[PDB]
Amino acid sequence: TVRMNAPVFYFAASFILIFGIIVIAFPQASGAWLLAAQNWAANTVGWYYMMVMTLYLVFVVVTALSGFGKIKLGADHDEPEFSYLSWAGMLFAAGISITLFFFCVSEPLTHLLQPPQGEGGTAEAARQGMQLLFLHWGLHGWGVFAFVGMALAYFAYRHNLPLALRSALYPLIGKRINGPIGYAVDGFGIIATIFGLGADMGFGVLHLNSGLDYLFGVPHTQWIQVGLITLMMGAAILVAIAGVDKGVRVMSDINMLLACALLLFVLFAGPTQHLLNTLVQNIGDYLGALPSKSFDVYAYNKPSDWLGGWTVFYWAWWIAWAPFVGLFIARISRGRTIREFVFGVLLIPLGFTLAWMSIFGNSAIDQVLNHGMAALGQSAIDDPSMTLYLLLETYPWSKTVIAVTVFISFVFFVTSADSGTVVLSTLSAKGGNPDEDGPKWLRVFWGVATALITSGLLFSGSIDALKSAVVLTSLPFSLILLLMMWGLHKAFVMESQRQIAQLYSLAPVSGSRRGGWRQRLSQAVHYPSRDEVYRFLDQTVRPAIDEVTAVFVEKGLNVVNVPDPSNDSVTLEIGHGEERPFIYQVQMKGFFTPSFARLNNRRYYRAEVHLSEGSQDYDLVGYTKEQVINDVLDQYERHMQFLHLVR
Amino acid sequence: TVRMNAPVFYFAASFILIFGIIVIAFPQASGAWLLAAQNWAANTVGWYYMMVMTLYLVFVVVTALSGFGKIKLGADHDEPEFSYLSWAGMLFAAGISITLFFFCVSEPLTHLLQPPQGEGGTAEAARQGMQLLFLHWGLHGWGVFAFVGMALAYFAYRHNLPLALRSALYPLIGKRINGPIGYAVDGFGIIATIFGLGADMGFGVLHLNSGLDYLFGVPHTQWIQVGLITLMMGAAILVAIAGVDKGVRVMSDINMLLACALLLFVLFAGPTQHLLNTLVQNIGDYLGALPSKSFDVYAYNKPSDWLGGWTVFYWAWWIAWAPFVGLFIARISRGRTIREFVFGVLLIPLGFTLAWMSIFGNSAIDQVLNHGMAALGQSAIDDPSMTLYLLLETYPWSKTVIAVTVFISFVFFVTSADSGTVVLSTLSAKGGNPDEDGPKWLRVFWGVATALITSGLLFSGSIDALKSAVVLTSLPFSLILLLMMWGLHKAFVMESQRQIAQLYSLAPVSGSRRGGWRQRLSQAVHYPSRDEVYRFLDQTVRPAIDEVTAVFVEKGLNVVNVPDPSNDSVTLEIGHGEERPFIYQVQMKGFFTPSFARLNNRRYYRAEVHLSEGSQDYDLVGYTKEQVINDVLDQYERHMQFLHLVR
Amino acid sequence: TVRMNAPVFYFAASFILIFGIIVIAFPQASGAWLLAAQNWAANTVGWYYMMVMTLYLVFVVVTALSGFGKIKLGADHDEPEFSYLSWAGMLFAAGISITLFFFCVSEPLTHLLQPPQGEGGTAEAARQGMQLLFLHWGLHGWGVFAFVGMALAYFAYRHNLPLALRSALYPLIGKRINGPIGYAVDGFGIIATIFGLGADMGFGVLHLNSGLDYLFGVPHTQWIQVGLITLMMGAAILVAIAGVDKGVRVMSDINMLLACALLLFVLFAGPTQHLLNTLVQNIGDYLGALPSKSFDVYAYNKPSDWLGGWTVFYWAWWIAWAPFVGLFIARISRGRTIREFVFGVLLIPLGFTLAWMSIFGNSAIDQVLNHGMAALGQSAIDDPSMTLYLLLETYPWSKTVIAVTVFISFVFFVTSADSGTVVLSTLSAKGGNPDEDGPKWLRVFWGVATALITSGLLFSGSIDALKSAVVLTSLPFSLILLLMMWGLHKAFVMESQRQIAQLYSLAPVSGSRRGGWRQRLSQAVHYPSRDEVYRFLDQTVRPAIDEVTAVFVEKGLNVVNVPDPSNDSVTLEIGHGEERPFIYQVQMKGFFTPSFARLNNRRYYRAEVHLSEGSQDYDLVGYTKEQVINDVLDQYERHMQFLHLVR
């Protein structure tokens, strides 16, 4: 039965509430305190983000390209419960929101006129600013979602652990994950999600306010935004507390067909040929620049504040969004292998996002360079939420297309911030059936808690406060994301050696022909003592090795005997001219008696058998002398077939 | 018995004849109509060629670097019938002709003085124009020959299908490939070959005319070229209709020793040190620029017509040459693996071609930059077929070396356009022994049909008409080349799972000790009904599972019984403290009776056996109760050896 | 018992002695003769070094990334005798000496002011000159040590050959390696080591002389250096001839903790933030430029002498150091796999070296560019051994830190040039226990022989003579390093096929149930004649194949008989509708009788059995007719389980 998990709820809500309240009470001081922290972080912890963001991508790619990529996330008789398109659509319509509409047009126009290095307004700035757009929305962002999803699905479907963030710390601290060390890991992952989700409603409120101010005469006042947040959130709470389908699985197909029509309209109502050429140019530029652009911090230029507003903000953003998209996509991916999970997450959404960004960015670069539109390029720097409507009003039927864009962008928010509440409430609950969600009084709580965070940062220097508040609260989660990687590596090496131990144990020798299911059963639970095996080596093994070789010598063969200095080993050897000889060596060894056996025994011995390289080891305790001679013979005949094939 | 295949012959010859005739009749109009189509194609379908040309290379490399690279093209007892050098020589002297001699010197001198971007005449233009020469004659061209050859050899030597182009469409449309859908695939592949072969005789006629005009006083008139085409083709028809060896296999060794002597003369009679340095510089430049130069269309520069005369022409050229070289090299490669086929096609010819191009290009760049020869650099732009003889006349014994060059370049054409006719006639014939060629009245036809195509484009703006006619007729074959890739991928995944199904079927359990070759045979063709297995589970399996466990409990072990809610499953379980337990579960399941069994049965059942992960599944229908207890025992003893190795 | 190996000792010492003597006698002529050879080599054999240095790296990486990377260097029951940190420390403190202290500061300041291309003093020269420092001290240098170590460990621990350089030439020339062809391979590898070790004491004598001249008033005269060489060598001979531990294994831990404290002091007493940023910038620059910078010879620029003093010297240096570090690290790496050896050599020392170089280089670039210190940047060009003490005297407590640097740099030399003598004396000795070193009168000899080489080049144009003498004597060893690669490739392909031949030989068929250990033994050494098998095929195999199929036909199955044209093959076939049929074909074949069998037999025959693709081949000579029918039945039942799984 799902109920609240108090040591997580009270640790997260208490941190959220007073921050919200004291940002609501003192706006002038907080707005000034945040711009100091942004400048400090940009310079002090800029290298750290760039270093940690590439480790995740390299890890997931190397894991999917190796032998571990054939491991099924589940049992061997499990099958996928969704189709491929219905899976990819739900995957895409979870990590996309109105920020795409906020950044599609105004970011390239900013990098064209104010480059991080060089003189702007040229055709080199236009080619350099379209690589930054591909870096910020490319493989680095989608490579951490796959990491978190694949780390959560493994431990939950192959080890029957709960579906939570603290489970990946099991190979390190055992079952202490149900104490005070898991309650902090699961608690630092709600704060990042709340801040990354509340910074996304603020980027949508401005977009919608500008869209309505363009059509009607609605001003940019404060009660307008206060009443707009209410409408944006009441539609997302009432969908979460009233049903799931006609929703989570239907909207994913409804909006995916709304987006494609608009993309095709923009492609076929403009300069189609130019766009088709630049789309192919951008892919080559990105693939060529990828390995050296991942570490660029502009360390030999004059100091500046460019890195903290563009490249560090985006990594903080993706890291804050990871623990939600990962836990949502780890629930619909049962019965798949690791390789087709990774290459399925890194194939379709990446393609659609890059196509969108490239078409919408080049369609505006073409008009600022070639057709002389300075009023379009000035608002991208002054008023960044009206540039899209200035570009779209140069098309046929512009007043009918803007009204459809304002409506299409509104469902992109409701599709994400309704699985947001579901995941955020299933993360704060304890017990119950694994494939079953938490109580539906926590959704109404986590929905109301996000508007309070959003409309405290909107009234404190809207855009820069939103950008600066995410870079701080996403810092303690980057270390948990490394502990999870360590644990996953240990769990992988612990089962790379479980496949070796299952092949080597297939029919080492015969002996079942001796018969007797009652005498073979009593012998299968006995652990012999030290010199009890010594009464086996000299009564059965010694009188046989010296007896089978008698027929060998007087039958044409060269049998190399040695004096025995070991008192336990019984070796036999035969030379075949120049190539490899025939080793057959028995040897006693002792081990520790297992737990489920102790009478206090504490020690036992086994008489192994070794051969040439690439063989198996097995014991003969319980054989009969006539069965030992029949074991050295079919190991010799197996040797003669080996020698026939190498030549 | 090989005979004509009318639905292909009449579909190809009819398309060829009227085009030839109406280009012969109206030269002024056709010469003007072709320069419009060239400019149109260069701009409209430039991105498409660049996209499709990289897919083939990536496909073949990834296929050869994976587990599929160990598949032998033939049966497991097949052996290669040729040596390695004799194989590589025939491979090289098939896709090389007089175009090498036409483009070796005049293309770098053109890229040095008229760069696609920058100011020409410098030492940066010289370094940039030697990367284009390596891109146009490098891995992209040799990567499609390997693709077509490996796709044709697989379906013909592992599935016993004919050696034709339509066979790769078998996994898609079944045996409808012998209808109207294969007759178009095999028909669109003769037109591309005819045009790509007729554009190569025109590049040789000009070379030879200039070579004779240098030595003697032969003008550049029209009857000279008309009478020269006759000599170039009558030597290639009379070799095809009079024999094969002293020819296909001897010329490949004769000309390979003519080329090396000339290369070594040019290397050791010039500035050897400079050439040895620049050869190593060019390799590094190419390998560094490869990943980003594959998608370069110059999309941010001022519009121009450079791409349609240089980079799109070369891809169209290689695509038009693929269906001939591929089908020629798929006939001499029986008994090899995929990896040593791909890495053998991409090793020796690439090396020789790149060495030739680099030495001959740098030897002329060095003289235009450093020694001030403007008359050599002007003819490369005005008269591009005399530059080689202007460079070669600055060497010792120039009149004796030019006469040997004119003779060496003449056999390079006869070595290729005599396997051309052989392949083109074996592609238009039907039936007969697979390793056997079509009738030798079709060679005389396809040889005469190519001169008519060549001397209709020579008299219509010689060089540009030849360049423009290949870009159009090679467009419908690029899509067939993608359908073939789809079919090959399906055929690969259909047999990746045939190796799994052959390992899992090795000795699942014992039972042959029961004896009786007549009673074991009658049982091996029976398909039991539903409740007939129910009369097996309760008479043999239930009275045994509850009977073998009796000895277990009263012998020190923790045997976990469960009430049975399934009415068919009979589960047994044992705990070993903390590590993995011992699952042994039987379960009934039903399948569809196969085709070769139906009395109308239509349905049958089997009683499988499942264990822990990584095991095999098998049925017990036909066991004896004493044989079932002896099967749960040696699966338990196999479990205890597994537990001993993990610890 | 270890003793001298005269054909190597007398071949090496004789070459060393007269060179030393005639360089001591005529300094003016030799100093002038060496600067000619340097300029000649730089221009004539510059491309050769660049080509051969990348082959080693590509070879080792491709070998470690493939299936050969799982081969253990030893026997399957061998275990490592050292920990990981204690192993990596000994690995690092063998190939590091005072040259690090000589080149850490003065090389970047030289590349900043005198670039190989461009204008110096800018922020582009500073970024370009920090990539050369990473190229010269990066993967290329550590990739040849791994190659030599992995080539020496394999042949010595898996084939029981001596631990010497000539053993890798065993797969080529057999056991002629104990004649005049191994005595030259092992002799050309002492000269390279002696010269590379004597050029390292000269780089330390100057460093120490400057360090003492800074503190006290010691001049730069000649008797000072003569008396300083004595002190530098008498401390290295007395440690070699008095003990091993408190030394080889303790100093490796003592100095590794001296280095880290100084690195951390330099990092935390300067501009920490700038250094942390540039450290991350340099890694990306290096990884981006690596593939094209490996072949750069500046072939399109004006001729110069830059390449022979910087990039060719470093490759000659690493090649001359390889045969010592490789043979030292191949002695402490028993019981490891190839992959964890390669990725262990290419992980820790590379990281420490690159961190040191980056911090120490940027800490001085920052002061020459940003703080205006021209007297620091002038001595880097005039007097290159005082720049470190000019940089270090701008820190707190400079006179107390310089005195500790002078002491720390002195043990870095003694840690390397005491395993130098050990390896150099175990390389000139013959016989004895493998893991046992040569006599300790050869260490006193090889130590005295190096001072004579060092103080003949110090007095002949100190720095340039040292740089020029290494480029000449390391040329004949680069070819032996290619012969070793060829031999290693042959040894790898000779055992890739030894794993195939050990899987295919596991239980081909049954027959041991026939019983009789005395009759099964006599049959296991018989080689049948030609028509003796013919009296088996017609008495046992023919009357059975035609007898088992009788039950098949009249039991509902389609059995396809064929007339027999072969007179030896006995084929059986069954169609199953459309999918694969059941082939069971017997066939006679003859082979050559092995060596250890010849009565002169010289020939014998076997009756193999073939099936569908992916099967094993075995003979039936010695079966009974009732055992042959029972073999075709359980191959048919194994076929029906295969067909059930593919569908």
CSV table of C-alpha atoms in Angstrom, one decimal, chain B residues 170-396:
chain,number,residue,atom,x,y,z
B,170,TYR,CA,14.8,-11.7,-52.8
B,171,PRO,CA,14.3,-11.2,-49.0
B,172,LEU,CA,11.8,-8.4,-49.9
B,173,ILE,CA,9.6,-9.7,-52.7
B,174,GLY,CA,10.2,-13.4,-52.7
B,175,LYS,CA,10.4,-15.2,-56.0
B,176,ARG,CA,8.6,-12.4,-57.8
B,177,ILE,CA,12.1,-11.4,-58.9
B,178,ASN,CA,11.5,-13.5,-62.1
B,179,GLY,CA,8.7,-11.1,-63.1
B,180,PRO,CA,8.2,-7.5,-64.1
B,181,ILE,CA,9.9,-6.1,-61.0
B,182,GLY,CA,13.3,-7.8,-61.6
B,183,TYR,CA,13.3,-6.9,-65.3
B,184,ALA,CA,13.4,-3.2,-64.5
B,185,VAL,CA,16.1,-3.5,-61.8
B,186,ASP,CA,18.3,-5.5,-64.2
B,187,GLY,CA,17.5,-3.0,-67.0
B,188,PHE,CA,18.3,0.3,-65.2
B,189,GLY,CA,21.8,-1.2,-64.6
B,190,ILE,CA,22.8,-1.6,-68.2
B,191,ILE,CA,22.0,2.1,-69.1
B,192,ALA,CA,24.3,3.4,-66.3
B,193,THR,CA,27.1,1.0,-67.4
B,194,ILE,CA,26.8,2.0,-71.1
B,195,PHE,CA,27.0,5.7,-70.3
B,196,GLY,CA,29.8,5.3,-67.9
B,197,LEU,CA,31.7,3.2,-70.4
B,198,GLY,CA,31.1,5.5,-73.4
B,199,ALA,CA,32.2,8.6,-71.4
B,200,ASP,CA,35.6,6.9,-70.9
B,201,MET,CA,36.4,6.4,-74.6
B,202,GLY,CA,35.9,10.1,-75.2
B,203,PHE,CA,38.4,10.9,-72.5
B,204,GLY,CA,40.9,8.6,-74.2
B,205,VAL,CA,40.3,9.8,-77.8
B,206,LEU,CA,41.4,13.3,-76.8
B,207,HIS,CA,44.5,12.1,-74.9
B,208,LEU,CA,45.6,10.0,-77.9
B,209,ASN,CA,45.0,12.8,-80.4
B,210,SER,CA,47.1,15.2,-78.4
B,211,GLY,CA,49.8,12.5,-78.0
B,212,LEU,CA,50.0,12.0,-81.7
B,213,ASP,CA,49.8,15.7,-82.5
B,214,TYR,CA,52.9,16.3,-80.2
B,215,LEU,CA,55.1,13.8,-82.0
B,216,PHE,CA,53.9,14.0,-85.6
B,217,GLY,CA,51.9,16.8,-87.3
B,218,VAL,CA,48.4,15.3,-87.0
B,219,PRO,CA,45.7,17.9,-86.6
B,220,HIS,CA,42.6,17.9,-84.3
B,221,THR,CA,40.0,17.4,-87.0
B,222,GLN,CA,36.9,15.3,-86.9
B,223,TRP,CA,37.6,12.4,-89.3
B,224,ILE,CA,40.8,11.8,-87.2
B,225,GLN,CA,38.7,11.1,-84.1
B,226,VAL,CA,36.1,9.1,-86.1
B,227,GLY,CA,38.9,6.8,-87.4
B,228,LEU,CA,40.5,6.7,-83.9
B,229,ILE,CA,37.4,5.4,-82.2
B,230,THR,CA,37.3,2.6,-84.7
B,231,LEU,CA,40.8,1.5,-83.8
B,232,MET,CA,40.2,1.8,-80.1
B,233,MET,CA,37.1,-0.4,-80.4
B,234,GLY,CA,38.1,-3.0,-83.0
B,235,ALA,CA,41.0,-4.1,-80.7
B,236,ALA,CA,38.6,-4.6,-77.8
B,237,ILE,CA,36.0,-6.6,-79.8
B,238,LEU,CA,38.5,-8.9,-81.4
B,239,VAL,CA,39.9,-9.8,-78.0
B,240,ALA,CA,36.5,-10.5,-76.6
B,241,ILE,CA,35.4,-12.7,-79.5
B,242,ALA,CA,38.6,-14.7,-79.8
B,243,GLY,CA,39.7,-15.8,-76.3
B,244,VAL,CA,39.9,-15.1,-72.6
B,245,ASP,CA,43.4,-15.8,-71.3
B,246,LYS,CA,46.4,-14.2,-72.8
B,247,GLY,CA,44.1,-11.5,-71.8
B,248,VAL,CA,41.9,-11.2,-68.7
B,249,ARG,CA,44.5,-12.9,-66.5
B,250,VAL,CA,47.8,-12.3,-68.4
B,251,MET,CA,47.3,-8.6,-69.2
B,252,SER,CA,46.6,-7.9,-65.5
B,253,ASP,CA,50.2,-8.9,-64.9
B,254,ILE,CA,51.7,-7.4,-68.1
B,255,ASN,CA,50.4,-3.8,-67.4
B,256,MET,CA,51.0,-3.9,-63.7
B,257,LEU,CA,54.8,-4.1,-64.5
B,258,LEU,CA,54.6,-1.4,-67.1
B,259,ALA,CA,53.1,1.1,-64.7
B,260,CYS,CA,55.6,0.6,-61.9
B,261,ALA,CA,58.6,1.3,-64.1
B,262,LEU,CA,57.2,4.6,-65.2
B,263,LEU,CA,56.3,5.6,-61.7
B,264,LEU,CA,59.8,4.8,-60.5
B,265,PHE,CA,61.4,6.7,-63.4
B,266,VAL,CA,59.3,9.8,-62.6
B,267,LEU,CA,60.2,9.5,-58.9
B,268,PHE,CA,64.0,9.0,-59.3
B,269,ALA,CA,64.5,11.4,-62.2
B,270,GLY,CA,63.0,14.4,-60.3
B,271,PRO,CA,63.3,16.0,-56.8
B,272,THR,CA,63.1,12.7,-54.9
B,273,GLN,CA,63.4,14.3,-51.4
B,274,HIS,CA,60.6,16.9,-51.8
B,275,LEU,CA,58.3,14.1,-53.2
B,276,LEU,CA,59.0,11.8,-50.3
B,277,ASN,CA,58.2,14.5,-47.9
B,278,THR,CA,55.0,15.7,-49.6
B,279,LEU,CA,53.7,12.1,-50.0
B,280,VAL,CA,53.7,11.7,-46.2
B,281,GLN,CA,52.2,15.2,-45.7
B,282,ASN,CA,49.2,14.4,-47.9
B,283,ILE,CA,48.2,11.3,-46.1
B,284,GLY,CA,48.0,13.1,-42.8
B,285,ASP,CA,46.0,16.0,-44.4
B,286,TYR,CA,43.5,13.5,-45.9
B,287,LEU,CA,43.0,11.4,-42.7
B,288,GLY,CA,42.5,14.6,-40.7
B,289,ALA,CA,40.0,16.2,-43.0
B,290,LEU,CA,38.0,13.1,-44.0
B,291,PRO,CA,35.0,13.3,-41.5
B,292,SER,CA,34.1,16.9,-42.2
B,293,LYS,CA,34.9,17.0,-46.0
B,294,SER,CA,32.3,14.4,-46.8
B,295,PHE,CA,29.4,16.9,-46.4
B,296,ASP,CA,30.9,20.1,-47.8
B,297,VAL,CA,28.7,21.8,-50.3
B,298,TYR,CA,29.9,25.4,-49.8
B,299,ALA,CA,26.5,26.6,-48.5
B,300,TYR,CA,27.6,29.9,-47.0
B,301,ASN,CA,29.5,31.2,-50.0
B,302,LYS,CA,28.3,33.1,-53.0
B,303,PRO,CA,26.4,30.8,-55.4
B,304,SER,CA,28.5,29.2,-58.2
B,305,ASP,CA,28.7,26.2,-60.5
B,306,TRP,CA,31.9,24.6,-59.1
B,307,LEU,CA,30.2,21.6,-57.4
B,308,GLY,CA,28.5,20.2,-60.5
B,309,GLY,CA,31.7,20.0,-62.6
B,310,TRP,CA,34.0,18.4,-59.9
B,311,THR,CA,32.5,16.7,-56.9
B,312,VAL,CA,29.1,15.6,-58.2
B,313,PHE,CA,30.5,14.3,-61.5
B,314,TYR,CA,32.9,12.0,-59.6
B,315,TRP,CA,30.2,10.4,-57.5
B,316,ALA,CA,28.0,9.9,-60.5
B,317,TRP,CA,31.0,8.3,-62.2
B,318,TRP,CA,31.8,5.8,-59.5
B,319,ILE,CA,28.1,4.8,-59.2
B,320,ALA,CA,27.9,4.2,-62.9
B,321,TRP,CA,31.0,2.1,-62.8
B,322,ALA,CA,30.0,0.0,-59.8
B,323,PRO,CA,27.6,-2.6,-61.4
B,324,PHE,CA,30.4,-3.8,-63.7
B,325,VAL,CA,33.5,-3.9,-61.4
B,326,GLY,CA,31.4,-5.5,-58.7
B,327,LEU,CA,30.0,-8.2,-60.9
B,328,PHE,CA,33.5,-8.9,-62.3
B,329,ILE,CA,35.2,-9.2,-58.8
B,330,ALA,CA,32.4,-11.3,-57.4
B,331,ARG,CA,33.4,-14.1,-59.8
B,332,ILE,CA,37.0,-14.6,-58.6
B,333,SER,CA,36.3,-14.4,-54.8
B,334,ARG,CA,34.8,-17.8,-53.9
B,335,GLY,CA,36.0,-19.3,-50.7
B,336,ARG,CA,37.0,-16.1,-48.8
B,337,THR,CA,35.6,-14.4,-45.7
B,338,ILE,CA,33.9,-11.0,-45.8
B,339,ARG,CA,36.6,-9.3,-43.7
B,340,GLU,CA,39.5,-10.4,-46.0
B,341,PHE,CA,37.5,-9.4,-49.0
B,342,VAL,CA,36.7,-5.9,-47.8
B,343,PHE,CA,40.2,-5.2,-46.4
B,344,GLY,CA,41.7,-6.7,-49.6
B,345,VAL,CA,39.7,-4.4,-51.8
B,346,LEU,CA,40.5,-1.4,-49.6
B,347,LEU,CA,44.3,-2.0,-49.4
B,348,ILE,CA,46.3,-2.4,-52.6
B,349,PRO,CA,44.5,-0.5,-55.3
B,350,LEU,CA,43.9,2.4,-53.0
B,351,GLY,CA,47.6,2.6,-52.2
B,352,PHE,CA,48.8,2.4,-55.8
B,353,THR,CA,46.3,5.0,-57.0
B,354,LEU,CA,47.1,7.5,-54.2
B,355,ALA,CA,50.8,7.1,-54.7
B,356,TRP,CA,50.5,7.7,-58.5
B,357,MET,CA,48.2,10.8,-58.0
B,358,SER,CA,50.4,12.3,-55.3
B,359,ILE,CA,53.7,11.9,-57.1
B,360,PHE,CA,52.4,13.2,-60.5
B,361,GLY,CA,50.5,16.1,-58.9
B,362,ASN,CA,53.3,17.4,-56.7
B,363,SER,CA,55.9,17.0,-59.5
B,364,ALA,CA,53.9,19.8,-61.4
B,365,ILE,CA,52.9,22.0,-58.5
B,366,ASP,CA,56.6,22.2,-57.7
B,367,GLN,CA,57.4,23.5,-61.2
B,368,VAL,CA,54.5,26.0,-61.4
B,369,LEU,CA,55.3,27.6,-57.9
B,370,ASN,CA,59.0,27.4,-57.5
B,371,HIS,CA,60.4,27.5,-61.1
B,372,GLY,CA,58.1,30.0,-62.8
B,373,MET,CA,56.4,28.1,-65.6
B,374,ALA,CA,53.2,30.0,-66.6
B,375,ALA,CA,52.8,28.4,-70.0
B,376,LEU,CA,52.3,25.1,-68.2
B,377,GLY,CA,49.7,26.5,-65.8
B,378,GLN,CA,47.8,28.2,-68.6
B,379,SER,CA,47.2,25.1,-70.7
B,380,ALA,CA,45.7,23.3,-67.7
B,381,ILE,CA,42.8,25.8,-68.0
B,382,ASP,CA,42.7,26.3,-71.7
B,383,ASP,CA,43.7,22.9,-73.3
B,384,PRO,CA,43.6,20.2,-70.6
B,385,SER,CA,44.8,17.3,-72.7
B,386,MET,CA,48.3,18.6,-73.5
B,387,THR,CA,49.6,19.4,-70.0
B,388,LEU,CA,51.1,15.9,-69.4
B,389,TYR,CA,53.3,16.2,-72.5
B,390,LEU,CA,54.4,19.7,-71.5
B,391,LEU,CA,55.5,18.4,-68.1
B,392,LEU,CA,57.1,15.2,-69.5
B,393,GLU,CA,59.3,17.2,-72.0
B,394,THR,CA,61.5,18.5,-69.2
B,395,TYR,CA,63.1,15.1,-68.5
B,396,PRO,CA,66.1,13.2,-70.0
